[PDB]
Amino acid sequence: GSEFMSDQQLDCALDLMRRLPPQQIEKNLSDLIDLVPSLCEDLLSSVDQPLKIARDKVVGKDYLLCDYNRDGDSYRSPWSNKYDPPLEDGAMPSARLRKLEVEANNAFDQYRDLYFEGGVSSVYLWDLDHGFAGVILIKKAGDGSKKIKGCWDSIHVVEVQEKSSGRTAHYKLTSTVMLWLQTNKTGSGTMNLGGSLTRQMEKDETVSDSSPHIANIGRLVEDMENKIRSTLNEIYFGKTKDIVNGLR
Amino acid sequence: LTHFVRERAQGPRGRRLPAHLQAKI
Amino acid sequence: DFEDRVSDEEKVRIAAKFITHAPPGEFNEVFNDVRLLLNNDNLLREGAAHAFAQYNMDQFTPVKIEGYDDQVLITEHGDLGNGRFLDPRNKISFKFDHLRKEASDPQPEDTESALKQWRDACDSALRAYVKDHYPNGFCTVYGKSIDGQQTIIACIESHQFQPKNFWNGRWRSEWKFTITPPTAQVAAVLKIQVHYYEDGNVQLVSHKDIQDSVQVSSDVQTAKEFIKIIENAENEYQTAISENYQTMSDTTFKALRRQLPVTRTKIDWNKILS
C-alpha cells in the first residue's frame, strides 16, 4: 500500500532483512510481519524470497510463484491465466495486457532456454494508469548428482510508463538475482553460501513494430543479467573467500 | 543502507492476504 | 486478555530470535531495527535481555579489561549466572554489561588447583598458536569438573569488521577434552560467518564438527599435543573451504546460467519474436 510517506518501521524492516541470514528469509519474513502486520502488503511485495515452483495441471507446465501472481492463497498460471485454487474474483490483467503477457512468456521461455538450458520461467504483467508493470521470473537448479549444489533465482520487476502519442516509453528495471550454493563434504563440513544482489536501470526507448516492448524489455533484462552474473562471480567466489582468509 | 526495493512497483491493490498472515492482523 | 498476552509473548520471542541472529559486527543495527519494529521498550529490555547475553556468548565476543593486556572471550563457560563472567587466565571475575559490552569491577576469583596447571599450560600453548595463526585472534581456556570429569575447554575468536565497505566476518572454534589418562576424546566445532551487504545480502554460514583423540600425560606435553590437533584440524577446514570455493566458481556456478547462449552471441530479439 505504501500508505505512509515517513515510515521508520518500514525502513528498519528492510534494513533488518539485509542483515538476517538469507537462508531463513521465509520464516523471518513471516515473523517480521507478525511484528508489524500493517506492513504486510509492503513487505510481501518488497522482500524477495526464493522462488517456488507449481504445476499448472490444465496445460502440464510448471510456473513460478511470487507475490505478484498471488491473490489470497491462490496463484495465477501464466499459461492458462487461471488461479489455483479457483478464485471467482481474482486479480486479472486486462484482455489487451494478457495478450502481451502471453507473448512475453513465450519470449522469455526462449531467453531461459538459451541462457539457462533448463529451469523454469514465468512472466506476470499488471495494468497501470498510463502503462504497466511486470515481473520476469527464472529459476534454475544445478546438478543434483553433485556434492556441491547450486540454485539461481531471477526476479526482474519492470515498470513501463508509456507515451503513446510520442510512440516512446520509459522503462525502469529493478533486478534481483538470488544465488544459493551448499555442500556437506568431509573436509569443510557444512558450507552454505547464499543470498542476493539487486541492481536498477532506467532507459527511454522508441516503441514500434521493429522495437516492441518485449524487445526493449528483453534487452534490458539480458544486459542486467549478464552484468549481475559477473558481479555475483566476483562477490561470491572472490570477495567472500578473501574475507574468510582474512579471518585466519 | 539504501533499498532499491522500497520504491519498486508493487502488485495490484486490494488483493486478499494469505491466510497464515490474516491470522496475524 | 489471554490472547493479547500470547501475542506480546510471541512478539518478544520473535524479537529475541532476530537479535540473536544478528551478523557479526552488526548487533547495534539489528537491535535498533528490532526495537523500532517491536515498538515497546519495556517488553524489549526485559523480555529480550536474554538475547543480548546469548548473542554475546554465542559470538565469543572479546572484551578488554582495564589493567590487563589480553582480552577475554564472553562464552557460556564463563557465565557465573549473576551478571559476572570469569576470566580464567587472570583468575578474576568481572561484571559485564551485555548491551554496552563493557567489563568492570574486577575481583579475585578462587579456582581449583586441580585443573589449574593443566589449564595454564593449555592457555600458554593456545595463545602462542593463536598469535601465529590469526591476524588478531583472541582465546580463552577453561578448566572445570563437568558431569563428573576434569575438562579443558578452549575457545578461539577472530573477526574483521568493515561496515564502511559493507562486510563483516568472524571465525569461532571451540575445543573440549577430558583429562582421562592415557587417551582422551577431543570434541570441537569450527564456525565461520561472513556477511556482505553492498546492494544486497550475501552470507557464508559454515561449521564443522570434529572428533579426535589426544594422549594425556603431563600438563605441558598434553598441551602441545592438543594444539597440534587444533592446528591440523583448523588448517584442514580452511583448506577445504578454499577448495570448495574453487569448485563452486569453476563448476557449480557455470551449471546455473551461461555467460552467453551456445550461439556465442547476444540474443536477436527480432528472431525470438517472429
Q: What are phi and psi of A183, to 5 degrees?
A: -160, 155
C-alpha dihedral over C99, C103, C108, C113, to 10 degrees? 80
DSSP state of C70: S
Closest by Cα among A74, A109, B16 to A82? A74
Residue at which a domain ends, from C77, C111, C145? C111
> Angle B4-B5-B6 (CA atoms, 0-180°, nearest 5)?
95
Q: Which residues sit opposite C72 in a β-bridge?
A: C63
**Experimental determination technique:** X-ray
* Contact indicator for C225, C213 with CB cutoff of 8 Å: no
In which residue are the cell numbers 565476543 written? Answer: C61
Query: What does each C-alpha distance from C251 to A147, C179, C257 come to in angstroms?
Result: 11, 46, 11
Whether residue C233 sits in one domain with residue C127: yes
* Contact indicator for A193, A182 with CB cutoff of 8 Å: yes
Domains annotated for chain A, with CATH where assigned, are 8-84 (1.20.58.570), 95-247 (3.90.1150.210)
d(Cα A217, Cα A222) in Å, to the nearest integer?
Answer: 9
Query: What does each C-alpha distance from C155 to C59, C127, C173, C230 come to in angstroms?
Result: 11, 11, 6, 11
Whether residue C213 sits in one domain with residue C93: no
Determine whether the interchain pair A188/C241 forms a contact, defined as Cβ–Cβ distance below 8 Å: yes
In which residue are the cell numbers 532499491 written? Answer: B4
Helix (H), strand (E) at residue A123: strand A120-128
d(Cα A139, Cα A194) in Å, to the nearest integer?
Answer: 15
Residues of chain A contacting B, Cβ within 8 Å? 1-2, 10-11, 14-15, 18, 30, 33-34, 37, 40-42, 44-48, 67-68, 70-73, 90-91, 126-128, 133, 157, 159, 172, 174, 176, 198-200
- What cell was used for A194? 547464499
With b meaning 16 or more CB within 10 Å and e meaning fewer, what string describes A210-246? eebbbbbbbbbbbebbeebbebbbebbbebbbebbeb
Whether residue C160 sits in one domain with residue C107: no
d(Cα A132, Cα A154) in Å, to the nearest integer?
Answer: 20
Whether residue C45 sits in one domain with residue C153: no
Strand-pair category, A83-84 with C167-178: unpaired
Closest by Cα among C152, C260, C33, C120 to A226? C260
Residue C31 belongs to domain spanning: 6-111
Compute the nearest-CA separation of A55 from chain B (Å).
19
Determine whether the interchain pair A40/B19 forms a contact, defined as Cβ–Cβ distance below 8 Å: no
C199 inside domain: yes
In which residue are the cell numbers 521470473 written? Answer: A137
One-letter amino acid for residue C72 of the chain: V
Strand-pair category, A131-141 with A120-128: antiparallel
Determine whether the interchain pair A72/B17 forms a contact, defined as Cβ–Cβ distance below 8 Å: yes
Whether residue C227 sits in one domain with residue C124: yes
Resolution for this model in angstroms, one decimal place? 2.0
The 3 state secondary structure assigned to A171-202 is: EEEEEEEEEEEEEEECCCEEEEEEEEEEEEEE
Determine whether the interchain pair A195/C160 forms a contact, defined as Cβ–Cβ distance below 8 Å: no
Query: How many domains does one find in chain C?
Result: 2
Burial class of residue C274 in the structure, from the number of CB atoms within 10 Å of its CB (0-12 exposed, 13-18 middle, 19+ buried): exposed
d(Cα A69, Cα A77) in Å, to the nearest integer?
Answer: 8
C93 inside domain: yes
Whether residue C119 sits in one domain with residue C237: yes
- What cell was used for A52? 517456488
DSSP state of C26: -
